[PDB]
């Protein structure tokens, strides 16, 4: 709920390049300035003879807001022989997937084709490039000697990628073995050390790979999406992968052991052609240090009040338990054909409340398909069902839809303010956007009314005027606040009190404040972080019995507290915000004594 939508950082790429198709953060190991990584898989490059090779760009955070391509590969197509290319890099979609871990950047071209050395073929084995500072190596685990659709010739390796905690790569190739799909995992140390430009099919030791299976599993698309997390408690990240055509288009998600690629757990979708497994994520949302599985089914159709099926999409949340079982819940989209669940991004702890959070995208929702991203906050029970924020894409396009939210990445504190921030890609308008998380102020409020019981015949107070006394009581409102991260030590609060709030438009308010002679009192306050309860007393009274014949309904004393956000800003330009999960109103009630 604390993302700054007023002034997000806005980045652009060449028209038609799908800039923003993939996004990630880049944090070097030397604590250098952080950057944004943005894939533009259709971007034209300087590679000789290559049309729309695609590129990955590094973007400064706010120093200049500028993006410069990363030179993974400056060359064109290698030749097998004169006028006989060994490979085809045009329209290879380099940058369709991008992932970074510390110094390392992995970027892939899922539609890279190669010839093979025996016949003149054009097989989309896919390829990747791994950059670690000075050294860059090619990583094409599917460019092997297992040729054609039967083997890995159409694997499109790099279609999805992730890094494990222990510097292993997880790579998805949805085309292997007549589109069964495949998962391959290699140690980054093996990928760099064994790289030889003269060898097209590199033998990596300690490679883990799923194996070809029976034809019944054909056309399942294993490796369409991947995520990593530990699910047998041995500290080694395990491989989670969406399989969206499996089980006769119900969709499945496979989890494999990260040490040996043994099958661990399966999930199965409930509805045909829902694309269950289009997206997957793993993050501990309920704070028990057990990774939880998130699975997106963007085409899921829900039954409405009228009984009509409506395509709104669905996301399933599976909490991991010590026993090994899973506790599953479903989250439905809000707008028809919006494809809620197309992208699921762990946010880290967005509001720094102790529970991790997530963002779920509906890339085709909103006005004129501008796109919507939903923020969901975690809690001990699981994920909170109601989104606490709604980001709306602002840009429209003239051909392919903007697709705001089609890719996202969070869980990086790029401005070092103590709250993780979020990147949203919008490739149909060639835009990528960073949203910064605002500091969160938690307020403890107190309101005491004494005496609670009021006897009209107890007139011990005298009004400022002649009056001849009234029945009075005390009201004491207190307020206390603190925060986490970059914040000032002084905040201006606007506090409002309203006596006998129950009574509505056209009803008598029985209680009034002593001074004001009105039922409303407003007081500005100044409070500092970590400080003590700062209280204030004032006095109120009851009208004469003559003016109200309602002595039964209780008199409610209502208190509101708001904050002026502009005055608390910091060097970033980033105002804090009140914790939306503590209510900003409190109320007590007095009662009229009866005889």
């Amino acid at each position, epitope marked *: 709920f604390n993302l700054d939508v007023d002034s997000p950082a806005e980045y652009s790429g060449p028209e038609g390049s799908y800039f923003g198709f993939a996004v990630d953060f880049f944090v070097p190991s030397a604590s250098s300035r952080m950057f944004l990584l943005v894939g533009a898989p259709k971007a034209n490059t300087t590679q000789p003879g290559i049309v729309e090779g695609g590129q990955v760009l590094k973007c400064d955070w706010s120093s200049t807001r500028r993006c410069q391509p990363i030179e993974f590969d400056a060359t064109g197509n290698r030749d097998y*022989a004169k006028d006989d290319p060994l490979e085809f890099k045009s329209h290879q979609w380099f940058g369709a997937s991008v992932r970074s871990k510390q110094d390392k950047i992995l970027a892939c071209a899922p539609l890279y084709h190669w010839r093979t*050395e025996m016949k003149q073929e054009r097989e989309p084995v896919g390829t990747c490039f791994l950059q670690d500072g000075t050294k860059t190596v090619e990583y094409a685990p599917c460019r*092997s*000697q*297992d*040729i054609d659709a*039967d*083997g*890995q010739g159409f694997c499109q390796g790099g279609f999805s990628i992730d890094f494990t905690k222990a510097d292993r790569v997880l790579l998805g190739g949805p085309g292997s073995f007549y589109w069964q799909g495949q998962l391959i995992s290699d140690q980054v140390a093996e990928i760099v050390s*064994k790289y*030889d430009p*003269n*060898v*097209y*099919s590199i*033998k*990596y*030791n300690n*490679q883990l*790979a799923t*194996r*070809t299976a029976q034809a019944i599993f054909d056309d399942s698309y294993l490796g369409y999406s991947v995520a990593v997390g530990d699910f047998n408690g041995d500290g080694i990240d395990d491989f989670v992968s969406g399989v969206p055509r499996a089980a006769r288009t119900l969709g499945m998600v496979y989890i494999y052991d990260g040490k040996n690629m043994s099958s661990l757990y399966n999930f199965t979708g409930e509805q045909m052609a829902a694309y269950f497994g289009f997206s997957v994520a793993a993050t501990d949302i309920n704070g028990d240090d057990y990774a939880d599985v998130f699975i997106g089914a963007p085409l899921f159709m829900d039954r409405g009040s009228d009984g009509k099926l409506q395509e709104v999409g669905q996301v399933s949340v599976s909490l991991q338990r010590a026993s090994g079982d899973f506790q599953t819940t479903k989250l439905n989209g809000f707008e028809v054909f919006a494809r809620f669940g197309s992208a699921i991004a762990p946010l880290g702890d967005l509001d720094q409340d102790g529970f991790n959070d997530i963002a779920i995208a509906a890339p085709y929702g909103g006005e004129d398909k501008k796109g919507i991203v939903y923020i969901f906050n975690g809690r001990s029970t699981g994920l909170n069902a109601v989104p606490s924020q709604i980001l709306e894409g602002q840009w429209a396009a003239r051909s392919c839809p903007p697709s705001f939210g089609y890719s996202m990445k969070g869980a990086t504190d790029i401005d070092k303010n103590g709250y993780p921030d979020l990147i949203v890609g919008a490739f149909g308008v060639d835009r990528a956007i960073l949203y910064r998380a605002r500091p969160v102020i938690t307020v403890n409020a107190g309101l005491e009314v004494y005496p609670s019981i009021l006897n009209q015949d107890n007139k011990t107070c005298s009004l400022p005027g002649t009056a001849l006394k009234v029945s009075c009581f005390n009201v004491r409102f207190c307020l206390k606040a603190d925060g986490k991260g970059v914040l000032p030590r002084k905040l201006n609060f606007q506090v409002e009190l309203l006596l006998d709030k129950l009574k509505q438009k056209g009803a008598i308010r029985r209680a009034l404040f002593l001074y004001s002679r009105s039922p409303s009192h407003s007081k500005n306050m100044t409070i500092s972080r970590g400080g003590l309860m700062q209280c204030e007393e004032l006095i109120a009274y009851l009208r004469d019995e003559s003016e109200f014949r309602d002595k039964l309904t209780p008199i409610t004393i209502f208190m509101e507290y708001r904050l002026d956000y502009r005055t608390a800003a910091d060097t970033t330009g980033l105002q804090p915000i009140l914790n939306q999960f503590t209510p900003a109103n409190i109320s007590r009630q007095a009662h009229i004594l009866l005889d």
Partner: antibody
Framework: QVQLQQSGAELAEPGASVKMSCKAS????????MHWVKQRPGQGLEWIGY????????ECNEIFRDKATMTADTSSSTAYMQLSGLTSEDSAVYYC???????????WGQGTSVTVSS | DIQMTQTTSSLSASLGDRVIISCRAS??????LSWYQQKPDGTVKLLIF???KLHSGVPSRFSGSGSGTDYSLTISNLDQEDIATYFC?????????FGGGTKVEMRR
């Protein structure tokens, strides 16, 4: 740390057949072709053929088209060659060798001697 | 089939010497020529592939040259562990074929 471990020496009478194994480790066996090479005692090297382990497809030198049959067990990372119709001309050391690509074979097994004798 | 012929079947060398082994193919093999070392015990290792490319783990002393039909392996600064038999092999076209072999023995 590629290692091709071949089975022990074979003996057989003329007209019989033998089957030898070649177990691979250190790389993903099913992603690379396995080649087989025959060396007669006091003679040169002769290429038999190759197998694509994961699909079972094979190509052979014309000489050995009827002599040898190659197979593979992907679950145990083991290639097999059977020599049938044995004669004294089939007495030799038989090597397995993984395919580097680039028309070369990068790692060799120690060889399996075959002796054809009554 | 492509016929491979290593003209000299044996040559003798002293430690540190430079040894050159020549291989000729009966047709253009487009640089798909490899070199193998076979030790007395039968161990076989790949040294050079694609005419001049070095296999991983192979010492820099070994290098290869040639094009078309003529190719050569060169051992500079001969070592005691280099006494073995060396074969060339074309991989341009099936069936793969080897040369007859060249044995390198110490001088005495």
């Amino acid at each position: 740390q590629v290692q091709l471990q071949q089975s022990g020496a074979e003996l057989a009478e003329p007209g019989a057949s033998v089957k030898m194994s070649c177990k691979a480790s250190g790389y993903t066996f099913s992603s690379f072709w396995m080649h087989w090479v025959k060396q007669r005692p006091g003679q040169g090297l002769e290429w038999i053929g190759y197998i694509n382990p994961n699909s079972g497809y094979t190509e052979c030198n014309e000489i050995f088209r009827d002599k040898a049959t190659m197979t593979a067990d992907t679950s145990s990372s083991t290639a097999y060659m059977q020599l049938s119709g044995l004669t004294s001309e089939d007495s030799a050391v038989y090597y397995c060798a993984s395919f580097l690509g680039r028309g070369a074979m990068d790692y060799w097994g120690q060889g399996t001697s075959v002796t054809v004798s009554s | 089939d492509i016929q491979m012929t290593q003209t000299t079947s044996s040559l003798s060398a002293s430690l540190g010497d430079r040894v050159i082994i020549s291989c000729r193919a009966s047709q253009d093999i487009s640089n798909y020529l490899s070199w193998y070392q076979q030790k007395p015990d039968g161990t076989v290792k790949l040294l050079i592939f694609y005419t001049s490319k070095l296999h991983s783990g192979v010492p820099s002393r070994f290098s290869g040259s040639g094009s078309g039909t003529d190719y050569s392996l060169t051992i500079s600064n001969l070592d005691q562990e280099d006494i073995a038999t060396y074969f060339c092999q074309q991989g341009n076209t099936f069936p793969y074929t080897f040369g007859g072999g060249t044995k390198v023995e110490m001088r005495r």
